[PDB]
Structure formats: structure tokens, C-alpha cells
Amino acid sequence: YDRGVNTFSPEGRLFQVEYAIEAIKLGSTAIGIQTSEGVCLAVEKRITSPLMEPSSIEKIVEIDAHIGCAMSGLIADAKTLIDKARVETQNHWFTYNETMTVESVTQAVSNLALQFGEEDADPGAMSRPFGVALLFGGVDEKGPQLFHMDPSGTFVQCDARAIGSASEGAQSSLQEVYHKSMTLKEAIKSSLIILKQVMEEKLNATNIELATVQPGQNFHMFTKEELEEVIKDI
Amino acid sequence: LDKQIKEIKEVIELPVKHPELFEALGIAQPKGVLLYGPPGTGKTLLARAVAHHTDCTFIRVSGSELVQKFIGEGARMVRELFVMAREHAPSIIFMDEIDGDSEVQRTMLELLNQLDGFEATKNIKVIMATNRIDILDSALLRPGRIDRKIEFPPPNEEARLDILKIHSRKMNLTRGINLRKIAELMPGASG
Amino acid sequence: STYSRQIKQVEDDIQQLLKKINELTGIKESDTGLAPPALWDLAADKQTLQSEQPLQVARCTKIINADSEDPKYIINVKQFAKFVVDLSDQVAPTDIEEGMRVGVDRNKYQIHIPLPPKIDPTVTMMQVEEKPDVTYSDVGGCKEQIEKLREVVETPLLHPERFVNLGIEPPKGVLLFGPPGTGKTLCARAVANRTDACFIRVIGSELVQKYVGEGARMVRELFEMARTKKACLIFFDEIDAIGGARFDDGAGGDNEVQRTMLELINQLDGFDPRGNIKVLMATNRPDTLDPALMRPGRLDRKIEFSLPDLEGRTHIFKIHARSMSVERDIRFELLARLCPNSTGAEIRSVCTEAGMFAIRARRKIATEKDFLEAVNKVIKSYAKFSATPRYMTYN
Amino acid sequence: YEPPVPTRVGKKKKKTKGPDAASKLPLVTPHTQCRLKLLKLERIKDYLLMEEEFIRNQEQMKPLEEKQEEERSKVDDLRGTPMSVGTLEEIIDDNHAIVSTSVGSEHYVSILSFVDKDLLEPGCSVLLNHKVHAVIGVLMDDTDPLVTVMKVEKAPQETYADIGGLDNQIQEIKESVELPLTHPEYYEEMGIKPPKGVILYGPPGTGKTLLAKAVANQTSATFLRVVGSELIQKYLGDGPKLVRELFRVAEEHAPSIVFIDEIDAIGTKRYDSNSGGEREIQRTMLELLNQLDGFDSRGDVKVIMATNRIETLDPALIRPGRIDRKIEFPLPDEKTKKRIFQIHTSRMTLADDVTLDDLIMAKDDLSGADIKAICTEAGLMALRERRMKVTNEDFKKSKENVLYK
Ligand SMILES: Nc1ncnc2c1ncn2[C@@H]1O[C@H](COP(=O)(O)OP(=O)(O)OP(=O)(O)O)[C@@H](O)[C@H]1O
Ligand SMILES: Nc1ncnc2c1ncn2[C@@H]1O[C@H](COP(=O)(O)OP(=O)(O)OP(=O)(O)O)[C@@H](O)[C@H]1O
Ligand SMILES: Nc1ncnc2c1ncn2[C@@H]1O[C@H](COP(=O)(O)OP(=O)(O)O)[C@@H](O)[C@H]1O
Ligand SMILES: [Mg+2]
Ligand SMILES: [Mg+2]
Ligand SMILES: [Mg+2]
Secondary structure, three states, X not given: OOOOOOOEOOOOXXXXXXXXXXXXXXXXXXXXXXXXXXXXXXXXXXXXXOOOOHHHOOOEEEEEOOEEEEEEEOHHHHHHHHHHHHHHOOOHHHHHOOOOOHHHHHHHHHHHOOOEOOOOOOOOOEOOOOOEEEEEEEEEOOEXXXXXXXXXXXXXXXXXXXXXXXXXXXXXXXXXXXXXXXXXXXXXXXXXXXXXXXXXXXXXXXXXXXXXXXXXXXXXXXXXXHHHHHXXXX | OHHHHHHHHHHHHHHHHOHHHHHHHOOOOOOEEEEEOOOOOOHHHHHHHHHHHOOOEEEEOOOOOOOHXXXXXXXXXXXXXXXXXXXXXXXXXXXXXXXXXXXXXXHHHHHHHHHHHOOOOOOEEEEEEEOOOOOOXXXXXXXXXXXXXXXXXXXXXXXXXHHHHHHHOOOOOOOOOOHHHHHHOOOOOOO | OOOHHHHHHHHHHXXXXXXXXXXXXOXXXXXXXXXXXXXXXXXXXXXXXXXXXXXXXXXXXXXXXXXXXXXXXXXEEOOOEEEEEOEOOOOOHHHOOXXXXXXXXXXXXXXXXXXXXXXXXXXXXXXXXXXXXXXXHHOOOOHHHHHHHHXXXXXXXXXXXXXXXXXXXXXXXXXXXXXXXOOHHHHHHHHHHHOOOEEEEEEHHHHOOOOOOHHHHHHHXXXXXXXXXXXXXXXXXXXXXXXXXXXXXXXXXXXXXXXXXXXXXXXXXXXXXXXXXXEXXXXXXXXHEOOOOOOOOOOOEEEEOOOOOHHHHHHHHHHHOOOOOEOOXXXXXXXXXXXXXXXXXXXXXXXXXXXXXXXXXXXXXXXXHHXXXXXXXXXXXXXXXXXXXXXXXXX | OOOOOOOOOOOOOOOOOOOOHHHOOOOOOOOOOOHHHHHHHHHHHHHHHHHHHHHHHHHHXXXXXOOHHHHHHHHHHHHOOXXXXXXXXXXXXXXXXXXXXXXXXXXEEEEOOOEOHHHOOOXXXXXXXXXXXXXXXXXXXXXXXXXXXXXXXXXXXXXXXXXXXXXXXXXXXXXXXXXXXXXXXXXXXXXXXXXXXXXXXXXXXXXXXXXXXXXXXXXXXXXXXXXXXXXXXXXXXXXXXHHHHHHHHHHHXXXXXXXXEOOOHHHHOOOOOXXXXXXXXXXXXXXXXXXXXXXXXXXXXXXXXXXXXXXXXXXXXXXXXXXXXXXXXXXXXXXXXXXXXXXXXXXXXXXXXXXXXXXXXXXXXXXXXXXXXXXXXXXXXXXXXXXXXXXXXXXHHHHHHHOOO
16 A cells, blocks of 8 residues: 555554554464473464364474474464574574573564565565564573564563463463462463363364473473373363 | 348347247347447437337437436436336337447446346337447446347448438439449448 | 134124224325324314414514614515514514514514524434434443543533533533444444434535535534534534545535535634534544544544454454354354454344354254354455455554 | 424424324234134224214214314315415424425414324425415325336346356345345344345356346335446435435335445446546445444345445445345356256257257356357347247357357
């Protein structure tokens, strides 16, 4: 239309940024919880047909051996951010022989957001914001850490953050059930409980993804047996 | 225009005089006719002749406001003329496009839409005359709207001779006029 | 079947009896506007025809020698004539003013009765006489919007004593704006249902007239007849029909409509006080409105009917599925989550289409699957024709 | 001096029109020929007997001046002759009104008792005494020529059986314009009002107007047909006025179906006779928006719209609440093409060498209108050769006639 991508509303809102933020509410619900025992990431696969293979719906991604990411919204848009996170990481290791801070990874991914434009831009520059919301979860010198990133490039550490279609109700439930000193098993169970009450379908070990980043241990995607072990309770 | 006379006859004379032919054929009687050709080729002449010979009332719809008081005090829709046409059935509604969008073709679209399946009284035919057929709206060129399109090409040498014979018959002519030579002297002429 | 013969006998007797009754009493004609004979006061009609003389309507023009005991009144009897007359003995001299319509006799044309000002019948019909069947309980997700609207258009009329005591002048204008189907006209209908003062509904397209200056005349007469009431509300639905911003495009582009809008603006806030009229306008294109019309003192409150949030959508789903024969475990919160940016009209259509899916399957109860298919058909399948994405740039 | 105060609330006439009047006998249930219906009918009969005896007695001892025929004659004398036709300009009081005669002169006259005072509204045509101009009646306005223009007097002969392949479309339109009238109990028991509006969209010739004709054939409601281009008027505000009057007429004949055919033609076509340009068309569209879903309460009026260009319509016009259902009419597939060919050749006398399978693929983008035109033109070719049996050569010439050139 007449408006450019880099246009400000009379209220001071970047139009395309707000419109990309509205894209997350159509995405699947993801829930990240940070606890002293580790970071738990959960997401709903939202299977639309029995023929579709659930294993191909990858919405929790290994960023590095100590960092994972859960994406919500336009999953295709999240591929570029994931690739930049996984390339920017191992570049810090290449030059400094150390793993990045989760905050540094989230900041590097955030710098990609808002790097879009129409005129006076590079040929490889993007045309629109990334219509995806990311939940980075990892372990670093500061222990376990969970960061939330949105298409405006605003990344912020969160104790327990829910994004996606059910972000409002899941966030309310997280506020109701989160306390700072709780185990990782309790975090996983609470996240699964919150997911189960917001899914359109019925929760099972196939339509959800669960991952954990614990101190000492590496990023771990939960298998079907491990998922069934915790689902059998609730 | 013998071919044009036969073509317009099979579509306007037969449905009025012999609806049983179309009923036996199992086809819908034609309701809309298009006559396309250069101006002065006899489209209005043939329309008036076919209205005269079949005893069908000839109504010319020019869209002029001067005659609106006769059509109706409302004048909000052109279909208000139908009340008059039904009172003089069989009727032939004629509109000539002199050539925004064309009002004559819009009136065609409205009248044809009414005549499609929403008109109770039969024997109400509708004729257009237009200079060109490639300018017509896609709605009018859609199959099923105009049941027959008849071309009125400019007369050739023999047709020009026939028109010359018809029109010079109204004059005190000396014997021995070589009307054939005069017809040859008018290449690309209209009636 | 054993009673059928007696049924028909007594039915025919009843029909004959009804015809016989109508023979003596009346009930006939009805094409010449004749009332039933039970209301015929014929003696009083004759006494009125004799005693009560007809009065021609004229307009007083000038009062000569009003101070003295012989004031002469120049009246303009419509298309008839112009006369210099005097008041009848039964009319006080102070009851007739210059420029007001009067009624005079046909013999000496002496002024016999002051008359109400002439109002166009089209303007008169614009006032609402049957209140709509919508209450504020039928609008969901608009708690703040409804409160702001009520404290301007309803509270000052209901309890004016709370405002005069504190020297408070309440706002006298509200503009409801938002994407189509968000509930602007629904809230206006709720206001008209709850209001007790005179409510006038004006559609902007009704203010477009064939002739020059006629729309401004209708606006003037609308505010004249609105001022003949102690408290009044005027609703301007789709004010963008005539409320567009003034522009000069070389030719006379929208000059007459701009004059109508200027007349409306002058009535709202001009040299003369507006009165106790509290106006109300609803439009889905508030960006096109003139800056002078969008100014406080003409449109003091600007209530935005944005698309409902999750709680608002759940509330609308509860409102529209209240009388539904739904199942026991319908997850209306999930349904509201499944349509992020949807108007209340889309939610109503979702409820109706879920009911239609249940009906088509010859089922008396609509399950949750029916609501899911309704969401797919309305929110998703019909999303090509959605007016939402285009119209939130305008709001 | 004080102004008179009317006792009637409002200034408009009574909404109810054309009722049973004094013949509104109580609805007796059950309709079955049982003794309880018999007893209810007898009770009505006894009340009518008592009424008849009472009225006969009262008229018997009423004075010779006060008799039904005598009072009617006195009413005629009070009205006099001729009875002028004026316009009710204003209702000053219950028995006083300002009325304007045909010469443009207004009069403050008295409304007599025998006038049907609930028929009086501003602008209504009243009958006045010739001498004193007192209101002596209300003239029942004759049907407007435009009212005749919209109303479809005779139902079209095209039925649902004459439509091939549009099963889902027929079901969707029946659920909105036919089932709510024939079987309202479904909607009442389900707790939902029927789908408000329906728009039929698709490529030209797909059968939108044919489905509207089929609906008009099997409908008990008044059918009003308006073409979109008919809403474009020559004067400012006349378009909105026409839309307003169309929906007023729809409200008068409730239940009714309003078929706004070729709605997109209001915007896709520009005529110089339209004084206002695109802005007057926009005002007409806003009036249509108000009529479809606006402030005024809508009765039993169903709206059907058809267009081959739905992308050019204002999205606020077809928003839910205004048009609930958007029924698509795709180009026919092979099964539907065969059904259409069999439908339009059912009354035909085909030859043994004519096969519809070959004609099924005359063109890739073949529609129902193209097939019907093929059949009609083939019959015309058979008529040219004075034949009743249509040959394959006739259909071959038909294809090159309608589809090409
Ligand atoms: N907040 C709401 N709560 C409940 N129902 C609603 C709400 N908003 C809209 N609806 C429903 O959707 C319908 C939309 O019609 P409405 O008159 O409210 O639209 P609008 O906002 O005036 O639209 P437009 O701008 O096209 O005139 C209403 O009649 C009502 O049934
Ligand atoms: N599916 C069909 N089955 C049977 N006949 C059909 C079908 N589709 C079209 N026809 C025939 O084609 C004729 C013309 O089609 P019709 O006018 O209904 O099309 P339309 O889609 O409304 O077109 P338009 O967009 O031009 O107004 C109909 O009178 C009917 O006889
Ligand atoms: N083919 C023709 N034969 C005889 N006269 C003709 C012929 N074509 C045109 N004319 C004469 O030309 C005059 C005007 O032609 P008209 O039919 O109005 O042209 P158009 O077909 O463009 O309407 C008529 O009065 C008619 O006598
Ligand atoms: Mg010509
Ligand atoms: Mg509205
Ligand atoms: Mg059509």
C-alpha cells in the first residue's frame, strides 16, 4: 500500500513491527520455565492431520549444546534467526574458546530484528520483520537462563514466559503456579499441565515437544518414552 | 439485407407467430437480438421493418429525458418502461448506441436480466444496434444473453445497386439511368 | 372425524354470525381512511365543522407599531398572498413574534393561532419512536467503551444534579469508531433502547440531497426540531458519508456535501449555543472526517471500538451462544483463542454456522466439533472477504 | 396561549398493516376434529349469539337518526363531494392538523372523528372537505410503479431440478432463504437466527442467477429483484433514496427476499449520467450498508446478492452480519457438464449420431451458460433447415458460433 515498512503510527508504533507481533497470536503455544535446576521448554505441535508425521514438526531447536530455542508464529521465519543464532554461536567459541552467554545469543538474534527496509538497503536485506517469537533457554555462568524475544527486537529475561496463541491464559497459569525455588521436574509437570488445558487436541506424547537444559548436562529433547513417563500423571 | 432479414425473422417473427416450433425443438425462444454494423447500414431500418411486418409494437429507448413523462413519473429505473411494453405485447424494444460507460448497453443489460426468467408476459423482444461488437461489455458478450448477433456490413456493389434502386424510385427519373455505374462509383458506401 | 360435521356446521354458523355482526356495526371501507363506527362522534363532528373555522397557515413578517395599541402584522400567506392584518381578540399581543408561523382566518386574515415551525417530514421521521431490542448486556468486550459512552450520552440526562452542583459541563459529543462489525451501531441501538429523551437516528447518506443547499437545510431543521425538546440525542450513523474533510480539487468536488458538513459543524459549535442536544456519530472511516468535525466541542469523546481481545471475544461468544442448544463442554475460551483478530459479527456468524452445521446433520444439540467447523468456515474460509485487515489502517 | 398537547405517543402511524381487523377470532386449538375444539367453537358461537342479540337490541331502540346506514349517510354528508386530496404536513393535535393542498397552500384544519387517526403520519395523503378543508379521511396510496418494478409477480419456471451440479450451493442457499420460512422450528429449537445474508459469487454463467430464479420459484415470500447498475441514479442522493425505498418496500411485503443481482456493477461501471462520481456511488454503498445491517430494525427480509467480481466490492458490504454466507459457483466439472447438457437437451429430440461426451470438452472453461447457448443455437440451426431433430453437425456449428467469432 502507500505506507512503507519503516513507518511510524501517530502513537509511536512501528506499523510493521506491531503487525508482525500480531502474527504470533496465530502460532502454537510455547512455554518456557527457568529454575535453579535448569530450563524447561515446551511447545504444542498442533497436528492438523493423522497423516502428517509429528517428528517433522520441529519447534524446539538445539541452538548449541548449552542453549535451545522454542519458536512460535511463522515457523519458516524462525529458520533464519535460528541459523544466525547457531552461526553466531561457535563464532564466539572460534575466537574466544568459550560458549556464549544466553543473553549474548539473544542479543545477537535481536539485532537481526528491525534490520528491514525498502530503500537505501542492501540487496540481501529483509523486507519485513520476522513474524516469530523466540524463547531461548540455556545454562551459562549465571546458571539457567530463559530469554524471550519478539519481532520488535526486544529481548528480556523471564522466569517463566508463555508465547503463542494461548499466551494470555498460559501466562496467567504460569503466574499462578510459578515459584522461584522449585525443581525442574515440577517445572516440566506444570508446563505440561498448562499446555494440556489450552490445546485444541488432546495431549499425548506425540503432539508436544519437551526439552531441558540443565547445569552440567547438555540440551536434551525428550523422547516419546520420557514424554509418556511425565504425561501419565497429567 | 436478405440474409439479415431471414436471420432476424427466425428470431423475432417465429417466436411470436409460431412458439410451437421452438417448443417442439425443446429450446428457449430468443429474447435478445444484437445488430452490429457501420452507421447507416440499415439496423434501425430492419428493426422497424421486422416490427412492422409482425405487428409487434416498436418502442425506441433512447434514454431521453424529454420522453420520460410518457414512460412514468418515477423514472428511477428503466424497467418502468416494461409496464408500457406489456400493454402492447408483442413488443420490440429498440435501442441504438450512437457511440464513461455506455448507457445503451447498461439498459440492454437491465432489460435482458429482467427478460431472462423474471418476466411473466412473453413476446417481448429486445434489439440493440451498435457500430462495433468488440466494444460491447463482457456481460453482454456472455453466451445466452444475446440470442442472435447479426452483422450489417456496408453494402457491396450489388447491395448498393439494390439500395439505389429502392431510393431512386421516389424520384422523377429519366429513362435509362445506369444505376449500376453510379453504384460502382460509390465504393465503401452505406445505405 | 365423528365431530367433523358438527365442526363445519358450527364454523359456518360462526362465519355467518360474524358477517351479520359486521352488517350492523361497521368494519368496511378502509380505503378512504374511515375509522370503525364505534369511534364516530358525528354530532361533535358537525359542531366542529360549524364552530371551528378553517385557518390558513401564514408567516408573520413585520410588526408595525408594536408599542401602541394598534399593532399591524404583515403576514405572508404561503403561495396565496401577503396581507396587513391585526390579531384576534383571543390572542395576546406578546404571543406573536416576527418570523413565526401563524394561522389566520379566510375572511379578514386576522391572526388566530401561533403555530409550530415548519419541519420537513423526512426530518420528522428521523426521530426514533420504537426503541431497538438491544441492551448493553448484548455488547461484550466493550466495558470501558460502554462506560465512556454512557457517562456522556446517558448519565447527564438521567442524573443532571450530579453535574450542575460541581459546576461541571459534561461532554456533548461522542464519536464511535472502529472496524466494521465491531459494535458501533450495536452500542448506538443499546443507547436508543435505554434512553428516555428524544432519540433521532440520522444516516449520513440521508443527508445527501438532489438540490443545492438542501442537505444543509435538513441539518438546520434537524437541530431546530432537536431544540424543541428539553433533552435530545442525535445519532449520526456512517457520518463519513457527509463528514469528509474539505478539499479543493479544481472542480466542484464535493462542495455541496462539504456545505452540509459545515452546517452540521456550525450547529454543533457555532455562534449560537447548541442547546441540550448530545450528538453521537459512528463511522468505520474516522480518518476521512474533517478536522473541524473531529474537534472537541463537536466530537468531545472519541471511543474506539477496536477488535475484542481474548476476554472480549470469550464474552461475545457467551453472549451469542446464550440461547444456543450447545453441548455441556464447549470450550468457548479455546474458540476465542482460535480467532485472534475477529469482530463480534464474525463471532455471531460462528455461533450461527455452528448451529447450522448441527441442524444440517439433523441434530438438536451443537457439539464442540460443530463450533470448530464454524470457526474454520467463517474465520478461515471466509477470511478472503474479511473487512478487518483493510479497515484497521483507517482506524 | 398554550400549545395543544397530543395524547398519542409518537408521530408515526401504527406499524401493523393489513390485519384481520374485527374478524380476529381467537385461535382455537387443536385443529383436530375433537370435542375440545368443538367446545371452543361452541363457546365462540355463544359469545357471538350474545353479541348479536345485544347489538340488535341497541340498534332497535336507537333513534332513527342514529342507525348504521343513517350514520354512514351522515358521514358521507359531512365529507361532502368532491373530497380534495392533500398532504398531511403535521399533526398539531389529536383532532387538529396542518395539511397542504395540491396548490401548495397550507391550512390548519380539524381532523374529524371518523378519520382513521392511526393511519395519519406526516407526508401521508389525506382526504379533506372541499369547502372547510377539514380532514375527512386518509387515502390508501396506490402501489408505486417502482413497487411493481421490483416485485416479481409470477414465479420463474426454473426449479431446483433444472440446476445440475450445484448441490452444495443449493443446500447453502436453502438453509438461508427457504428452510427458515418452511421449517423455522429448526432455528428456534437451535437458538440461532438464520444466516442473515447470502452472496453468490463466481465466474460468469455459472448459475448464480439461475439459483436465484430457482429460489424465487419455490418461495412463499415476496421476491424483489434489483440489478446493481439500477442503483446508479442521475441525481445526487437519488441512489441512496432508491436503496432506502427498495428496502422500505421489502419491509412492507414481509416476509420478502431481496435479490440485488450484479451488485458489483454499481462500482465497476462509470456512467456520465451519474452527476456525483465515485463519491455518490460510495454514499449509495453506505446507504446499502445501513439497510443490510444498520440502526433500523429489520423484519423478515432476506438479501441475496450475486456478482462475478467480488474482489471489487467494498469488504464492509459483505461483512458477516450483512452477508453471512459467501457461496462460490465454480466452473462446472465433467459430471456437472454432462448433467447440464442432459438438462438443456431434455426437451430436445437429439439424433443418434449426437453424443454429449464429445460436447463435454468443447472448451476447457465451459460454463452452464455456454452449454445452454450451444443447445439453443443448435436448435436454431435445426430450425433453419426446417428440422425437428438436431444433428451432430448442428451442434458442431453451434460450438463455432457461440464460443468463437
Ligand atoms: N461487542 C459486541 N458484542 C456483541 N455482539 C457484537 C459486538 N460487536 C458486534 N456484534 C455483533 O455483530 C453485529 C455487527 O453489527 P453492528 O451494527 O454492531 O456493526 P458496526 O460496528 O456498526 O459496523 P459497520 O461499521 O459496518 O456499520 C451486531 O449486530 C452484533 O450482533
Ligand atoms: N449449473 C447449471 N445447471 C444448469 N443450467 C445452468 C447451470 N449454470 C448455468 N445454467 C444455465 O445458464 C443460464 C444462464 O446462466 P445464469 O444467468 O444463471 O448465470 P450467472 O452465473 O448468474 O451469470 P452472470 O454472472 O452473467 O449474471 C441459466 O438460465 C441456466 O439455464
Ligand atoms: N440496406 C438498406 N437498404 C435501403 N435503405 C437503407 C439501407 N441502409 C440504410 N438505408 C437508409 O438509410 C436511412 C438511415 O439508416 P439507418 O437504418 O438509420 O442506419 P443504422 O442502421 O445505422 O441505424 C434509412 O432511412 C434507410 O432508408
Ligand atoms: Mg444508425
Ligand atoms: Mg454500523
Ligand atoms: Mg446474472
